[PDB]
Amino acid sequence: VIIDLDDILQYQNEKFLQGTQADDLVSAIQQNANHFTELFCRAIDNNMPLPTKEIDYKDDVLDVILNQRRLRNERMLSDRTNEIRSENLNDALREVVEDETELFPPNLTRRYFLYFKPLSQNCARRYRKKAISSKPLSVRQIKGDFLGQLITVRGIITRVSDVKPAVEVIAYTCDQCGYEVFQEVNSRTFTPLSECTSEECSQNQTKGQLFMSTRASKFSAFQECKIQELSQQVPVGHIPRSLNIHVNGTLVRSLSPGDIVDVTGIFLPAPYTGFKALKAGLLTETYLEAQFVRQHK
Amino acid sequence: VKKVDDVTGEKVREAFEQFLEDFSGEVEKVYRAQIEFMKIYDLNTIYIDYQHLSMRENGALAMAISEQYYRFLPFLQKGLRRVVRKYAPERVFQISFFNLPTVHRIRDIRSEKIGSLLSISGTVTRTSEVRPELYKASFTCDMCRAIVDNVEQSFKYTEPTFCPNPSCENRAFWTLNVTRSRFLDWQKVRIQENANEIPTGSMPRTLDVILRGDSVERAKPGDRCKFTGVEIVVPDVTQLGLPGVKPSSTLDTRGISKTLGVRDLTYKISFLACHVISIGSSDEINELKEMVKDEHIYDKLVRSIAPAVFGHEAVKKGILLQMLGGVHKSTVEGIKLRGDINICVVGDPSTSKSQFLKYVVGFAPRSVYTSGKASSAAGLTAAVVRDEEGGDYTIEAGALMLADNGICCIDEFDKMDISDQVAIHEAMEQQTISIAKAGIHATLNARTSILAAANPVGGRYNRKLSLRGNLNMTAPIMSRFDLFFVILDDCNEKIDTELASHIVDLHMKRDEAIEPPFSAEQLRRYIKYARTFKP
Amino acid sequence: SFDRPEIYSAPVLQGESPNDDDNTEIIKSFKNFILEFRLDSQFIYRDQLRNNILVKNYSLTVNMEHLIGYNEDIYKKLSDEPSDIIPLFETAITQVAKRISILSRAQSLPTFQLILNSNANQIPLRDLDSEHVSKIVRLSGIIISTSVLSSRATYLSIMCRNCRHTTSITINTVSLPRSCLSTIESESSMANESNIGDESTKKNCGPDPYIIIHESSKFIDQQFLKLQEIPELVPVGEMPRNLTMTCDRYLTNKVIPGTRVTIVGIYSIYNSGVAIRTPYIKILGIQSDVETS
Amino acid sequence: LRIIWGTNVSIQECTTNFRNFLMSFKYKTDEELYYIKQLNEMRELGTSNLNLDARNLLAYKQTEDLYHQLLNYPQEVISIMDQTIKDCMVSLIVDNNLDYDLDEIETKFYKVRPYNVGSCKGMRELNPNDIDKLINLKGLVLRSTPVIPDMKVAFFKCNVCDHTMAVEIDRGVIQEPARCERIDCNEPNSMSLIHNRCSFADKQVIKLQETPDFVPDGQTPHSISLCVYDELVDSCRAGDRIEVTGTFRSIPIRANSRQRVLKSLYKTYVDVVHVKKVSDKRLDVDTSTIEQELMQNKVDHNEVEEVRQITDQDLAKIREVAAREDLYSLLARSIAPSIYELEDVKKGILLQLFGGTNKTFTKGGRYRGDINILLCGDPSTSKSQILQYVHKITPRGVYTSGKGSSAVGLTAYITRDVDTKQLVLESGALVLSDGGVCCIDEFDKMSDSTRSVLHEVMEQQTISIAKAGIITTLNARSSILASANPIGSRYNPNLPVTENIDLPPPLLSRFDLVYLVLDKVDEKNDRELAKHLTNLYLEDKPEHDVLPVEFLTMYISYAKEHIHPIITEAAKTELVRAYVGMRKMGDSDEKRITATTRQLESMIRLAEAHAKMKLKNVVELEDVQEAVRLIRSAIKDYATDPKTGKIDMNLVQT
Ligand SMILES: Nc1ncnc2c1ncn2[C@@H]1O[C@H](COP(=O)(O)OP(=O)(O)O)[C@@H](O)[C@H]1O
Ligand SMILES: [Mg+2]
Ligand SMILES: [Zn+2]
Ligand SMILES: [Zn+2]
Ligand SMILES: [Zn+2]
Ligand SMILES: [Zn+2]
């Protein structure tokens, strides 16, 4: 899914011109892009329509698993509601039903990726705004104050890594209690679990041993690219510098060496990696997270 | 607390004892006589032919031992000890099997036979120094001063598991006493695939062989040996990073009251050998006398060298008299006078010089063949392998060191570099190589002979110029080649027809049209005998 | 600079066949007993639990004869291992009370307190001995002294005074952590950097670096009692025997000295010869005979 | 009815469909039941592996869904098929009362190997969502690690009562007992592990050089890692071209040996389930080189076949074709149909492919029928397309340029493995091409240092290495096909060939044949060639009495493998006479290629190759005469002046 900011700006201006109030979602997204991804994902999940085509033998195993998970969710919900009503102890019934039951979170049932694209100079000029996110910049000009923003970089690619699977959520299965345990990961390294964490094994005295299940895990297609300055941007008598870009999801394989491109991305920090002896405080390493690519040819 | 027992292990023990006491136109019994010999001569090992062990009890013992040698070895030791006590009055005893029905290749090993006795053949590449091995340790307890003795190790440093006296309940806290323990001699050897078993388009394999006790220092680098012994496994830390799932071990938490030691199981295959024999008098002194009493013996000898090549009697007479060398002299002032002979054969590529080199390398006892450009300074001379996994450095021999008191064949001699030319020069000057690397200094013997093949500098031997003008060698090395044989082409009809007839005879008839006066074994026997007269 | 990863689960399959003597099955059986047991065609325990929740008294009073009548196995298990079974029944009560309260609200609870009553034969105070240690006993006596109410913690919020790492503790001999937990707890990638600074000096908060924040903690009531044999039956020429009892929460301020009472409790010990220990009782139930109106 | 969680497979439905497909299927010999006779032949011969062509399932109506289920969920489907196959075998034996000895089959195992999975788009084109799917690859083997044992049953002992335990691995984990199971002895933490008493399996890792059909823009070669287990170990040798079918896998790797920390980014490899070592577009490996490997395969009971199968109908057709009298010219015309005329060049290429007879003297001594060829001529002729055809038709070989090579790179080297972090040896081009054809382009730009090594290989087909860590001699039994560009712009016919080519005259005498491709202007030949070339562009796809490539390869392979010509006296006399004649003719020097014994060897090899062609077993006068005529024609001595070594431009015939 591609969210364009020109559409948002048009929506805001349409709301304004006829009087009713509207907030500057454009500025908010521009300044804190990394936080709005989850808001958009949840808003979409609250509205996704039902499938109009049955699931056949020519469909993806991923979709098969997602459908199974959703049906299983519905099954536990209905079973719990029936059991609670049987006791003779509807909004309250529903609320206790959600409270007393476990589910598969929305992120393990989503099947799509979400990306943003910058504000066009033409649209900003027509609406009398300043499109910060679409002003090309060199790696020279990108300083610390730009961290956490959505920015556009103009450069020439020099190196691209192969596509490899990056893990986001690991899944284990407990034979003792039949539960599935999900462990998040957002670091360059992680540690595997050993003993169960489900409710039954937690309360019991004899706990089961977890095992790893690759198919149920949550993987991401990941590439890293190096971008370099153009000749005309380097000041007099200096050497061009570089920058690091990350590509995740369906945007991979879109960059090849020698390409002169404009890349839109969120600027994020990363932990320090130099020598200890030269560390003075909380130093950080930076990278760009890609959202949109535009070729010059 | 009675100890569980292996009825099959015992049964095989008594079966082995019955074999020892029973297996025997004068009849004789071999094993009792060998035990008497061992008592007489103060030895430690017994030699038990595998074949003799087969023709009893329908061979069930033979199999059981073969596929379960590891399990039953202690019971065999126990039976040997008991029979020795019965029929004769600390000693560590060893058994040695040999003469197995078949021999396997290093390329044909499999994990199915782990722990089984078998036989292998290969070429040795390296050997380490003999070092003592911890065999049966002694420990002192800490919370009490109790002493435990004779703790077996079984291929890894093992400690006592529980204090023997209930007065102290110590476990896993001990100190090793190096003053009243026993040790055994221990050596490591590296063997390589033999030349003619290497499959198409592949590089040779290598394998480790552990030698214990008196079998140590029986291998020699550069020889072909047959080993018989057990196949084992040892830990391997390097396998991390390979694809696949590597077994892990974790403790069972079920059934233990409540109110993390995980290990990895990667390994590599090794070989703990028990018998090693090199693989290449008697009535034949009669034939030796008969042949030496000949009168044209020299002519027959000369005719017998390199029968597959036509002519070149002078070159044959050189290859002979290079096989037999002079005598080394020592002067009172310490001056040493050489007794070796070196030969150079000069010719353009179209000639048949390389056949002489191939014949010599195929026939001579200690010989190594090498090409000018496919070698290196380290390949010649020697190298130092400092990464001896258990301790100090070791020396890996080179081409020159190989064939010591032998012959080295150098093809494409004219392409050798200045550095290796200097190395060969030093080898001829003094029979030594000086190694100085990684701060290690050493001197190694190279009492060798050199057979070199050289091409004219311009491709063709310009007969107008002199030998110095035709060759590319340096004056120092050139001065010490006492024989230069230049081979050239002469066009003549009878010679041409004879040569064509000979070649076609070889192709059509193959081995039939060779008929040399003497065979390889006879020639080797004669040379060995004649090499010890010192005229 | 990242946040902390999460962990969670969900049921999919059926594990091994449940065994009878496991905590989950014990809880299920206790819940069934609470919600089903009938006497005179009444749901006595469900009704009184509902009334207690309405009255804001988070306790349930149970009689052991009813339990032995309904089921014997769990009765024996409770009589033999009281310290292990009571928490299970307490959490079952809490689970049921959650549903009752949430339904009633439309139409933040603590752990409910179990109170036991009984009428089986008592044991004279002079016949307690080793065999009764850790079992459940019934006694009769006269109260002679009650101490003043004490204070104990049930939920503590603590902070490390050096690196300001915060955490919480819940009770239901707990001690504060001896060393800072921020090291073993690798919350975030940036936490690893924060755990080091100013060159080579390693981060060490010291021993006992934690302090309690009283503005955000919860406490309960505890009390001590003394019980002595009836003076009538004392042997001649010997002073009587007495014994110490501990009660808490809703069993405080129930009696006054001079009352003749029956007590249901646990025979336990503590350390205050070579291996001697001082016995005492944990109060589970009190029954008065009505004195000095 | 009852699916498996995460999948959509139903065990009952799948097994029923598989049994029905086995009991009813045919190619529509084509009307008879197919898998029934395969099963019967298998149970007759004792084999345990069934090679299933995954395309077959897509024809029958029922299994149109089992095909996709097999592609998507191989793990369950393979086991289901194995169980169904065993049940079918027992049913087949019992329902007809053949014989009552069925315990062996009821006890043994079976396996099914899919080998025709749909086309793949190359390894780099896959995505994370393709893990644990079935795919296939094409590549060239480079290296294979030695056999690695993998534990399957762990053996424990009690150090106080000698009680022994056996534990089975479970998904790669071993559950070590914490207490002795004996009632008398239940001491805690008494179990010890005896490594030598365990039972181990076999595992091997192979490095593959993938050669995808479709290559995107700016993409370079790479390597892949394959895991083989049990029987398949040692079934591949470096230099072989193979087609592999396996499952796509993933795994995390420990950051370091000390810790138990893992890396987020995963490592990918392949798990081999089937290997195909044969093709219809290329010859079959010369069985004279893999003698021991065949016996090893028979011992190991691995069912991989090295050479293709031949039917009685095919043999009859081969005999019929060999019976005719224009076979030689027919085959010559067949080789490289896209190349016009050059009849003698094509004949030489054919004879090279056929090769001579390999003698072997008991008591030591080797002779090989390899034939070396060098091409000289005008730069603009079709002397390079010949190299491509031979490279793509031969089983093994490497195509190299003179200036882009090195002495070490042609023989061997030592390199650090990036995974195991140790040093391992690797093979050069000349060793990789063992048993095949090595193509060298621009042989006259190669340095003297580089050219030095070719002498030994062309002399005795071996290479001797004395380098750090290795001292040994390797086989290099490969033929040489080389091309060269004459000095300057055009081959001047007013100078001797030695003054035209930039090679030492002595080196030329080693080659068996030397070809001079001269370009002469003639209207008829120009018209013919121009029409031939222009015809190819008449329609968007090719449509050009020529045998098909499959039949040609089948014939050549059969001839190479099944016959061995021998020489006779009538041939010997002619050989001697012709060699003496050559030595005499031409007897002031460096005007021609001086005759030597290599020429007599060339006659022997070429006569043997001609006799081997046309399915004979005795070399004779016709073969000898043809060989001598071809040798003379290659250098076209008929148009040469035997006094000055010049060419008469008007005598050569196009
Ligand atoms: N006899 C022929 N048959 C078919 N094509 C030919 C012939 N002679 C020349 N050609 C054409 O001319 C070109 C020959 O160039 P090429 O063979 O690459 O040069 P080289 O002499 O280096 O091999 C090819 O494109 C080919 O199509
Ligand atoms: Mg070309
Ligand atoms: Zn669990
Ligand atoms: Zn002790
Ligand atoms: Zn702290
Ligand atoms: Zn035991």
Numbering used by the authors:
A (entry chain F): 78 to 166, 178 to 385
B (entry chain E): 100 to 123, 130 to 194, 260 to 429, 443 to 463, 509 to 763
C (entry chain 5): 2 to 108, 131 to 195, 204 to 303, 320 to 340
D (entry chain C): 177 to 204, 220 to 735, 740 to 782, 786 to 852
Report text from the authors:
Loading of the eukaryotic replicative helicase onto replication origins involves two MCM hexamers forming a double hexamer (DH) around duplex DNA. During S phase, helicase activation requires MCM phosphorylation by Dbf4-dependent kinase (DDK), comprising Cdc7 and Dbf4. Origin activation depends upon DDK, which phosphorylates loaded DHs, rendering them competent for the recruitment of a set of firing factors.
We then performed signal subtraction of the symmetry-related DDK subcomplex and refined an asymmetric structure of DNA-DH bound to one DDK complex, to an average resolution of 3.3 Å. A recognizable DDK feature maps peripherally in the structure and is only tenuously tethered to the DH, via three spatially distinct interaction elements. A conserved zinc finger motif in the Dbf4 C domain engages the Mcm4 A domain, and the intertwined M-KI2 domains from Dbf4-Cdc7 engage the Mcm4 B domain. DDK binding to Mcm4 stabilizes the Mcm4 N-terminal tail that is targeted by Cdc7. This could be due either to the structural flexibility required to facilitate kinase access to multiple N-terminal Mcm4 sites, to some particles being in a post-phosphoryl transfer complex or to a combination of the two. In fact, we discovered that when Mcm4-engaged the core DDK particle becomes nestled in a cavity between the Mcm4 and Mcm5 A domains, which are juxtaposed at the dimerization interface in the DH. The Dbf4 BRCT domain is connected to the DDK core particle via a 40-amino-acid flexible linker. In fact, the observation that docking in cis is essential for phosphorylation in trans reveals that selectivity of the kinase target derives from recognition of the 3D shape of the loaded DH.
